[PDB]
Design a protein around this ligand. Structure first.
Ligand SMILES: O=P(O)(O)O[C@H]1[C@@H](OP(=O)(O)O)[C@@H](OP(=O)(O)O)[C@@H](OP(=O)(O)O)[C@@H](OP(=O)(O)O)[C@H]1OP(=O)(O)O
Ligand SMILES: O=P(O)(O)O[C@H]1[C@@H](OP(=O)(O)O)[C@@H](OP(=O)(O)O)[C@@H](OP(=O)(O)O)[C@@H](OP(=O)(O)O)[C@H]1OP(=O)(O)O
Ligand SMILES: [Zn+2]
Ligand SMILES: [Zn+2]
Lengths: 151, 373, 152, 476
């Protein structure tokens, strides 16, 4: 593998010659195999843009330029009311959730605990499953509570 | 120094070039010697041409008592995060370059926002495994039963200390407060493993830069420690692969790579950026740049990567490109102004909460209420 | 330091330990008054017959122990007042229209608080048997639709 | 048992595990930290054992010989707790202040701590509560007597809210100090009813007024939570930050800090069911409560039926540089407000203590404590309230907790007022509720409504009122 050694030395010498820039040797299977880049990133594009468009001090040299040289971009950066709420619910243990789901003296607690447990179950529930749970709960409530909520 | 070719040496090439660039910088400024214990870098790749665009060192964060409300302090100075911030400044410079030289930039006018030119990709390299899930705990036991789930939950950095602590504690259920944090409550900052997950989900460009450009994703993440590719992949991609963000965003399947080559707690940190071209050293305890004059005094300057500097750069970009922006707007509202990114971030945090990964530890609102002018 | 001023200072420090919670500043000597200068707005020297010795610890307990005959009228009148709405006995049992809306409503960015409150409200008014039979149905629906949430 | 029952009593009542209790009490008894001597015992067939021996007070506290370090060290901690409860003594503080300067507020600082440590002598369970502590003093002609004394930095949990008013909602030190002052004022109203010369009150034009010269001074060992704390940053800020750093803030049940609201954010009233379902209860920050105190008086709505408004003459905070921003937060935010008639915006004197910046103590191990003491001169005895549920937890004869309301709760205040009304032959309606009784004070209600409306219209924010069912309970 004569030319494989050549490509390997060229890549090794490149760390001292131009540190921070890598130029792999393509279009030669033996030299290309010296540093085989993974197939997940192996996209080759015939674009005219090259690495040489990048140079140190890019931002500083652009800022110190005439304002007439800059064209228009997207428009109307309008503000938006930041969400004021902190984490709104209080979390409770899943074991505690199950505990209030099974207790049946809840009428003494005026049924607050059961509703809180249902809410906490639903809070950690995905949107589709939460919608299905809400629909099922409403359906079974309407079935068993006419003239109370159902009209 | 030297390593064997013919293997998957692309990521080893990244490691060697990152170290070579760092040592080239150390020649120009010898004060940064010894900072490379924890180093990270971002590369720009087009076809077979590679170029380093950001570089940073550091493994500590802002102290709780040194927080500010005007956004002049760096909150997280870990090497991975400051590499992303340097990449942000580079992307700002590239947006301005497109605004004046469209052929010479990396961006191209897309359907509704700037997009990368075809073939252009960004690659992240890290010296060691990111803190949090991606880094193996030397304590406890391998993940089993409930602890198997805890191997994938979110982790928080803790100020005035090292390592990442698990969520779900009684103290972490409460929201962070500015006065509370400054008077002694531990400030919770998300671990780098979860921040890389956010980077893979919503992109690396952030909220402010999302006004002009489409989301930009890392194409690969390389870490210089082996026999941990699967653990890193789980931390940054797998535990959110099922998430379905809004239309402009997607969960990027980054290519995890291991380099062939397999201690110190120095206070300062450094960052380098191609857009600026010059190195900057910040004190990680307070997240500010410290200089000296007449061989004395403690002249202190905000870092180029701080929120205030990013907002000022953004406003300068808008001024040069004649982009209309509201005059009384603040940093908090500017980030919320990008409708798509804000919705995607809200959806992602909600999804993380629902699938029981943990609560994302957002900073107090006072961190970002400062106005920009 | 003057001897009188030092004596006054030592008296104050000793009084800290001897009778905690009781401070007795000294004014008969302007030098002694310089030891602990009161703010000029707070000085307010007034001639009075009342003394701090009229305060006794536990005075409320002893005062309630006296019979009501020794207490004289204060000369006042007490009348209740416009509390808004009656929002009838708690805006808890809220009007049936609200629970009908909350159960029907779909956008629950409210974090499910209103929906659970409506569920509780409709649960309370149902009889013991009806409420009893509903709760097993709700628990079963939760267990069958989202086993990962509750059965984990 | 090999361990005295007093060790278990101290462990249970102090709220600290034996290991932490030993660590705390060893440090309070001597100048060192417990260190375990890992001795080993070898059997003829070969074995490894640990004893974790600790030495204290010159007594051998060698623990049980066991297999591992954990059980041996916890047994040694139990025996060391036996030792610390033996040799009855505890830490005390001598006065270390300076004189001839502005030391009046420092006089208030020492006498607050000195009074607290006197109470610890009769009730040893309140030791360590003084990390966050506030007190109220009554001054007349250079004579000062402490009136109310309280600790605590935590509030009521949303799970434990009740509609009958038996739970203390905000157990912060200054709030409980104000409530103790309320109890003292009730006692003084009763004293005026029975002995007019001996009371601090005299018959005014329309209500009882303080006798001339009588003043009330608030001392807090730390800056009140809210914008009085958020302004620690000496940098003045730019333009809009001045208005931003003056808006109203609210508390969380346990958060050591406060959360800023918004411009019509949180305009929706809090609901009882919402808090029960998991919504975090919002309580106005202590800075805003002190602003309210200096606008409307400290006497509250109920006492306004008997007495004219009473204001703090001075507020002292144990911080070396607090004069500017404490004054801003406490007075200046509402300095342009014009209350209806009996009330006025009190230009409270702001004082600074010396010797010690106390926030070093207020930030260490003060986050751990979940109970708060309160003491007032009218009652003459201390009371410990668990802040999580805001009620008093005593111990039964056969064990387990029995829980009783604190004397500072809404129900007890209403009962005290009704008892006074009965004794002084004051006519009150039978079926009134707690809310209706407070609404009965026409002038106070009007002033409070105007103050809240003015705070809204001036962009200061929304006052986070509690759900109405917090106060619908009938007293009689
Ligand atoms: O570079 P980072 O340290 O990761 O900063 C980010 C960044 O904030 P800035 O870019 O403003 O510094 C995020 O914002 P986005 O760009 O992603 O929008 C985000 O802030 P938001 O949540 O407000 O978007 C987040 O902060 P948080 O912790 O509040 O989530 C976090 O900041 P920190 O890591 O500094 O906390
Ligand atoms: O002493 P605090 O704990 O700060 O309690 C006060 C007090 O309530 P009490 O009735 O318990 O003393 C107020 O009452 P006023 O005496 O000043 O009238 C007021 O109550 P209202 O405004 O409702 O009359 C307010 O409550 P809110 O939170 O509703 O503003 C607040 O109570 P919190 O401790 O609940 O804040
Ligand atoms: Zn990290
Ligand atoms: Zn407070």
């Amino acid at each position: 593998d004569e030319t494989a050694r050549k490509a390997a030395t060229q890549l090794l010498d490149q760390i001292q010659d131009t540190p921070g820039r890598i130029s792999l040797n393509f279009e030669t299977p033996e030299a290309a195999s010296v540093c085989p880049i993974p197939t997940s990133l192996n996209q080759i594009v015939n674009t005219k843009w090259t690495v040489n468009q990048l140079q140190e001090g890019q931002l500083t040299m652009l800022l110190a330029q005439d304002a007439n040289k800059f064209k228009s971009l997207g428009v109307k950066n309008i503000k938006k009311g930041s969400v004021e709420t902190q984490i709104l619910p209080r979390q409770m243990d899943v074991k505690e959730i199950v505990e209030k789901l099974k207790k049946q003296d809840n009428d003494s607690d005026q049924f607050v605990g059961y509703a809180a447990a249902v809410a906490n179950v639903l809070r950690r529930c995905d949107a589709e499953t939460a919608q299905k749970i809400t629909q099922a709960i409403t359906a079974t409530i309407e079935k068993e509570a006419p003239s109370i909520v159902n009209c | 120094a030297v390593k064997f070719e013919e293997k998957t040496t692309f990521f080893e090439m990244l490691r060697e070039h990152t170290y070579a660039k760092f040592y080239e910088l150390c020649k120009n400024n010898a004060l940064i010697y010894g900072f490379e214990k924890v180093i990270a870098s971002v590369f720009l790749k087009i076809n077979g041409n590679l170029q380093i665009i950001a570089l940073s060192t550091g493994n500590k964060g802002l102290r709780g008592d040194k927080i500010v409300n005007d956004g002049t302090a760096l909150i997280d100075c870990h090497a991975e995060i400051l590499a992303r911030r340097g990449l942000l400044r580079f992307l700002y410079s590239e947006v301005l370059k497109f605004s004046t030289e469209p052929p010479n930039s990396i961006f191209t006018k897309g359907k509704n926002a700037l997009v990368l030119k075809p073939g252009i990709s960004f690659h992240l390299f890290i010296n060691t495994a990111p803190c949090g899930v991606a880094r193996i705990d030397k304590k406890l036991k391998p993940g089993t039963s409930d602890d198997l789930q805890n191997s994938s939950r979110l982790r928080f950095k803790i100020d005035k200390g090292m390592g990442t602590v698990l969520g779900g504690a009684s103290e972490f259920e409460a929201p962070q407060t500015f006065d509370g944090i400054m008077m002694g409550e531990r400030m919770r900052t998300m671990s780098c493993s979860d921040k890389l997950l956010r980077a893979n989900v919503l992109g690396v460009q952030g909220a402010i830069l999302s006004h002009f450009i489409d989301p930009i994703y890392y194409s690969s993440i390389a870490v210089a420690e082996l026999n941990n590719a699967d653990r890193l992949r789980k931390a940054v991609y797998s535990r959110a692969a099922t998430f379905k963000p809004p239309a402009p965003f997607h969960v990027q399947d980054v290519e995890i790579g291991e380099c062939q080559v397999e201690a110190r707690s120095t206070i300062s940190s450094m960052n380098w950026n191609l857009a600026d071209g010059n190195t900057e050293v910040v004190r990680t305890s307070d997240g500010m740049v410290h200089d000296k004059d007449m061989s004395g005094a403690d002249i202190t300057t905000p870092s180029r990567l701080c929120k205030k500097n990013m907002a000022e750069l953004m406003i300068t970009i808008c001024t040069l490109t004649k982009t209309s922006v509201d005059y009384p707007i603040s940093y908090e509202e500017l980030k919320a102004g990008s409708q798509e990114y804000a919705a995607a971030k809200k959806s992602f945090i909600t999804w993380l909460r629902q699938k029981d990964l943990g609560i994302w530890q957002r900073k107090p609102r006072e961190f970002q209420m400062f106005t920009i002018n």
